[PDB]
Amino acid sequence: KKDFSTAILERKKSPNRLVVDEAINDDNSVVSLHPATMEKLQLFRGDTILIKGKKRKDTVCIALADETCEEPKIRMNKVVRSNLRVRLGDVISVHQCPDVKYGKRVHILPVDDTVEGVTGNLFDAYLKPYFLEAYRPVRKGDLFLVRGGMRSVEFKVIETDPAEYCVVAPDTEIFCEGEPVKREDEERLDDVGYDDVGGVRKQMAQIRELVELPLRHPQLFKSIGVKPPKGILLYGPPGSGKTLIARAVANETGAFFFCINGPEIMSKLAGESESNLRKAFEEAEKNAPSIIFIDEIDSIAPKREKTNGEVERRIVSQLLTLMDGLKSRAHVIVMGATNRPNSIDPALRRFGRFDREIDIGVPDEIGRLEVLRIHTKNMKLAEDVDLERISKDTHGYVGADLAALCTEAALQCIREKMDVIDLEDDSIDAEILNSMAVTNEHFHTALGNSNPSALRETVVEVPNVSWNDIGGLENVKRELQETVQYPVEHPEKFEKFGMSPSKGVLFYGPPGCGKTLLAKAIANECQANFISVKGPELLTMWFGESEANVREIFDKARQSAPCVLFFDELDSIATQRGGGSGGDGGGAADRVLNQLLTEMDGMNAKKTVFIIGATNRPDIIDSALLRPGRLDQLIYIPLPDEDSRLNIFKAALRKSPIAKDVDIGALAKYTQGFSGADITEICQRACKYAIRENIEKDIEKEKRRSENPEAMEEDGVDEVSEIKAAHFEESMKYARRSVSDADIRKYQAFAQTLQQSRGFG
Amino acid sequence: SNPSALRETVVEVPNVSWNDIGGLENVKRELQETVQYPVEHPEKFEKFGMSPSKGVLFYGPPGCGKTLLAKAIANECQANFISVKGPELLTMWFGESEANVREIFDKARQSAPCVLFFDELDSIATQRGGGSGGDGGGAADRVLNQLLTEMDGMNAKKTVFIIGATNRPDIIDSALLRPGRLDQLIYIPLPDEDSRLNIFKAALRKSPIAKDVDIGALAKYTQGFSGADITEICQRACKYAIRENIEKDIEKEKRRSENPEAMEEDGVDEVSEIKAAHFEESMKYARRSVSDADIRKYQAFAQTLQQSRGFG
Numbered sequence A: 001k002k003d004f005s006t007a008i009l010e011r012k013k014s015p016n017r018l019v020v021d022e023a024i025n026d027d028n029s030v031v032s033l034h035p036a037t038m039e040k041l042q043l044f045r046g047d048t049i050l051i052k053g054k055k056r057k058d059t060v061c062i063a064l065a066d067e068t069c070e071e072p073k074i075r076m077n078k079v080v081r082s083n084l085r086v087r088l089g090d091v092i093s094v095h096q097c098p099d100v101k102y103g104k105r106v107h108i109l110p111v112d113d114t115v116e117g118v119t120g121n122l123f124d125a126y127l128k129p130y131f132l133e134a135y136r137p138v139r140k141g142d143l144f145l146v147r148g149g150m151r152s153v154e155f156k157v158i159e160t161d162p163a164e165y166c167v168v169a170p171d172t173e174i175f176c177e178g179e180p181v182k183r184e185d186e187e188r189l190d191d192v193g194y195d196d197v198g199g200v201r202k203q204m205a206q207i208r209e210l211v212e213l214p215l216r217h218p219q220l221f222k223s224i225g226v227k228p229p230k231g232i233l234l235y236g237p238p239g240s241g242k243t244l245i246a247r248a249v250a251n252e253t254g255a256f257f258f259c260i261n262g263p264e265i266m267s268k269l270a271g272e273s274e275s276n277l278r279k280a281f282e283e284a285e286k287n288a289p290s291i292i293f294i295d296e297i298d299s300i301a302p303k304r305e306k307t308n309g310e311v312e313r314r315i316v317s318q319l320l321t322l323m324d325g326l327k328s329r330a331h332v333i334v335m336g337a338t339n340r341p342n343s344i345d346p347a348l349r350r351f352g353r354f355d356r357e358i359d360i361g362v363p364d365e366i367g368r369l370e371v372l373r374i375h376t377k378n379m380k381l382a383e384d385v386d387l388e389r390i391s392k393d394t395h396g397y398v399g400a401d402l403a404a405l406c407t408e409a410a411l412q413c414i415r416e417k418m419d420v421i422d423l424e425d426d427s428i429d430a431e432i433l434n435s436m437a438v439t440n441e442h443f444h445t446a447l448g449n450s451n452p453s454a455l456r457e458t459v460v461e462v463p464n465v466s467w468n469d470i471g472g473l474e475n476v477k478r479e480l481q482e483t484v485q486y487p488v489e490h491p492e493k494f495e496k497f498g499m500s501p502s503k504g505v506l507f508y509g510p511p512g513c514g515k516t517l518l519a520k521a522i523a524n525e526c527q528a529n530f531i532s533v534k535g536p537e538l539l540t541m542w543f544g545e546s547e548a549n550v551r552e553i554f555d556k557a558r559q560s561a562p563c564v565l566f567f568d569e570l571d572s573i574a575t576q577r578g579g580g581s582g583g584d585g586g587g588a589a590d591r592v593l594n595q596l597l598t599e600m601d602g603m604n605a606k607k608t609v610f611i612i613g614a615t616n617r618p619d620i621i622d623s624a625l626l627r628p629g630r631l632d633q634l635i636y637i638p639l640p641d642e643d644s645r646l647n648i649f650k651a652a653l654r655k656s657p658i659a660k661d662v663d664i665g666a667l668a669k670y671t672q673g674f675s676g677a678d679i680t681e682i683c684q685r686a687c688k689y690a691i692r693e694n695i696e697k698d699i700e701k702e703k704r705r706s707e708n709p710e711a712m713e714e715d716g717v718d719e720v721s722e723i724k725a726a727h728f729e730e731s732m733k734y735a736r737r738s739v740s741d742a743d744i745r746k747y748q749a750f751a752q753t754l755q756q757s758r759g760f761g
Numbered sequence B: 001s002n003p004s005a006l007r008e009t010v011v012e013v014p015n016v017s018w019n020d021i022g023g024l025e026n027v028k029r030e031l032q033e034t035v036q037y038p039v040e041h042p043e044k045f046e047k048f049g050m051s052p053s054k055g056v057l058f059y060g061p062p063g064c065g066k067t068l069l070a071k072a073i074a075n076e077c078q079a080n081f082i083s084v085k086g087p088e089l090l091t092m093w094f095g096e097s098e099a100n101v102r103e104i105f106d107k108a109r110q111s112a113p114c115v116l117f118f119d120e121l122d123s124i125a126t127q128r129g130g131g132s133g134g135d136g137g138g139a140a141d142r143v144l145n146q147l148l149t150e151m152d153g154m155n156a157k158k159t160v161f162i163i164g165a166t167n168r169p170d171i172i173d174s175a176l177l178r179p180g181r182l183d184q185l186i187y188i189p190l191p192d193e194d195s196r197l198n199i200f201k202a203a204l205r206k207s208p209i210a211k212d213v214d215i216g217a218l219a220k221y222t223q224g225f226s227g228a229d230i231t232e233i234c235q236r237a238c239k240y241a242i243r244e245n246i247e248k249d250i251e252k253e254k255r256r257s258e259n260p261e262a263m264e265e266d267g268v269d270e271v272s273e274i275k276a277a278h279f280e281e282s283m284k285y286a287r288r289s290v291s292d293a294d295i296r297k298y299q300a301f302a303q304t305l306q307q308s309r310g311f312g
């Protein structure tokens, strides 16, 4: 089996599907099909055909024959590619045009920017010389290019007869009647689509199967005897993808789309907001199938505790009544968008309303890369821009932030060219304008000068850490496999033996021994999402979103199953219940303790969700967290031993320029009782010393050359500046253990007597 | 899919029976008198001109089966069971406020007969601080005083029994032990040699245990272990067996794939029963959750718990 969640997105290869390719002819009403492809299509040489494009756009052209066109090719020209909205490499479908429909009229009008420089009737110069007796097929809404000399005027197919498409026979009596098709109309063409949304595939698949399927193929649901949900609610960080995704789905499904912007509704006088809502719903019902996208729904339907006026609760109630009135099932779907899912009134998040919710969260590396590719598809990038590096460096960047980053890169490119650009002149040199290109350094500078927005939001992603990055801890990994991986990859195994596992683990040990890394590594092994939460972050949550922060992170973990919810730095929240119970500063630790235990109680029934903790202070750890049904498994992470420290050094320096004479194993003997953090700080000090050394070396070399320029560039060239043993010796000189010999036997004692904390002392 | 009404109080008869609980014969015998008789036979007490008490407190080492006894006695009497934990009560005040404890008690009244169990009294029933103060503990003080107030009005409802459970009898507020409240005191001891065999059997009553595993043998070696430790031993053993049979199946499939001509021999996946080796390995890492110094103290409290309403 496989994960069939992302199955609707898959394109089903068919004999009628041909890949896009360049044509041998620039004819706009004629393409060229390979003879074999035509035979599969039952077509013949020079036969009109309908090409199915993207965004519900299609054109009509006569297919020729040529053996150079490989089987998975169609050989269309640039104009057809633009009309279909398909770039090279897309997979269009081909259908026949048996009804050639020799048209009596083919209304043709020009575009203003393609007419600049025409001093004669366009009908007698462009249209008639190429259409009369040519029998060129024409598809309404497609821009065919024409030439009548030096100027090239492109006309849109305004109004054919038949209306859809026809063939331009000699009987087509028509001329150019005015210029009403100015180029600015392109703002509503090629606007949005599936290809314009990147970084979301699971959410996009969910939206498509909840919106497009009920509206295009309701027969499936009717036969299965299930009524599909009518309420969808997109939510996520501001600027992520919501309004784009809604419009993309609406345009791709080809259903009547009505946008109800919250500010627009609330900016009108009382009695017009409700009137507009009623009109929108009525029009959607009349023109079914339909979609009603309510952007910024939080403004028109905020939490009832926050809304003050009566003409706001009235609008909320009107919206609720209208949604309740949609149970007629007139192929109408109401989709929402709100960055504040909790700010929404609870009534909306109920059956018969917005009951199905999709979280358009922060994208991962591949998503950011795809977003950047989408946004830079039009910019004049140079041949040395590496978007992979930028995507790796852009952590916490939503799509809007990436678009702003591209814009800032372009601006920085302009600033570099400001020296050769004079602002006083009302016009800029054409050659200078066309020679501006965005380089990688511009992007790096823009990224340095740009800041992320969704850097505080919880991130649900598979960590990149593997077992290799962690040195030693073989037994800990061996037991973690049993505790986590087996009940996830093989859940039925436990049911076979009639015994359920435990969904809780606690890591206790000296600081810097690799407790945070183990959680990430085990998540990576099981390919399960990882949610990182720190005690300091939890403590500020109560002074803020309050009760709905811990509940929210746990709900997110539930929605993201399988998951590994890690609570680092339990030394603060899990502080043992004070004997003199009191205070509000610790009344937040008591909250993050009791409310957290309450959620732990309800989490054992979810399955495939494991709650892992980490504490450097097992003495103060609340004994309640150790209860069965909670973090009861206790795993001790010891200080690395002689063998483990070699692995730790190697991992810390797995990508370092270390010299050939450095004995990694030698340091292990001298560094005993040092945590992994100290072992990494040793390497950091060594790297800093090497940087100092090679900085001084390069400075001395350049100063030697400048102290008599006649001195030529000798064979001496900048070297690796590898980390010599001297640097490691100097680092070990200042290196100091972060765990004392008196603070290790105590950890051993707690390893012995930790779970006994639920009783007396 | 995720549930929605998973935080709401559930008023249902638990599925736990006396069989799931090992040992504790005397505790069950006295619980019958304390609970079942005044419910099934209410007129009996009126016949003798003496009313019973609607309060019980379970105090003992953790993992000895205090939560299970309440559910079992509810199941025996076919009475509804309402489970409330101290951590849940503490967050109620920062929320619905006064109308959470009142609401659970009203629900218990409406659901009579009922067994209102307050697990984890170690937090709400924290002894009234000598230096009374603070708002973090001002929630424990609330869930204490407001709870006692409801207990006072609950003795007239009849067929409603309030049971508590505390692993820290030292800090238990002396007010909860007053007559008209949780005044009956029942001590749940650590299981003895005979009880541990029953606990193992119950934990493994639906397990594939092999024919050579001596359940009684483990009982001798595991002394001072709570029932939770006895169940974690079985959990470790099951995990080891899962590892063993996972590796066995992987090796078998890899053997077949390392030359597909090798046919499917008579060897087929077996029960993968829990062999004695798994139990030995589990006992290797098994560690008591109750120390020998933290059992004599429970005995001392069994002796001198109800004397907490006076001085120290």
Ligand SMILES: Nc1ncnc2c1ncn2[C@@H]1O[C@H](COP(=O)(O)OP(=O)(O)NP(=O)(O)O)[C@@H](O)[C@H]1O
Pocket: A196, A197, A198, A199, A200, A237, A238, A239, A240, A241, A242, A243, A244, A245, A296, A339, A371, A374, A375, A398, A399, A400, A403
């Ligand atoms: N996944 C994406 N792929 C491509 N462009 C994107 C993507 N996400 C965002 N953008 C770009 O960034 C813009 C901002 O996103 P938008 O769709 O307005 O977000 P929003 O969630 O509706 N914002 P708000 O209502 O202010 O919280 C879009 O209009 C695109 O130009």
Ligand SMILES: Nc1ncnc2c1ncn2[C@@H]1O[C@H](COP(=O)(O)OP(=O)(O)NP(=O)(O)O)[C@@H](O)[C@H]1O
Pocket: A469, A470, A471, A472, A510, A511, A512, A513, A514, A515, A516, A517, A518, A568, A569, A614, A616, A648, A651, A652, A675, A676, A677, A678, A680
């Ligand atoms: N076993 C290890 N192998 C390799 N690097 C390690 C190891 N342990 C610690 N480190 C390094 O030291 C850093 C700190 O350790 P970390 O994994 O954050 O432990 P922690 O328990 O979260 N520490 P603290 O929050 O300070 O108590 C890691 O991110 C690594 O760079």
Ligand SMILES: Nc1ncnc2c1ncn2[C@@H]1O[C@H](COP(=O)(O)OP(=O)(O)NP(=O)(O)O)[C@@H](O)[C@H]1O
Pocket: A627, A628, A758, B020, B021, B022, B023, B061, B062, B063, B064, B065, B066, B067, B068, B069, B119, B120, B165, B167, B199, B202, B203, B226, B227, B228, B229, B231
């Ligand atoms: N007498 C017993 N017989 C069988 N299983 C038992 C017994 N005592 C404890 N257990 C097992 O151990 C688990 C924990 O015991 P439980 O009945 O929750 O005691 P508790 O007093 O609520 N513990 P705690 O809240 O940790 O102080 C039970 O759910 C059973 O799985």
Ligand SMILES: [Mg+2]
Pocket: A242, A243, A295, A296, A337
């Ligand atoms: Mg929006």
Ligand SMILES: [Mg+2]
Pocket: A515, A516, A568, A569, A614, A615
């Ligand atoms: Mg930690």
Ligand SMILES: [Mg+2]
Pocket: B066, B067, B119, B120, B165, B166
């Ligand atoms: Mg209890």
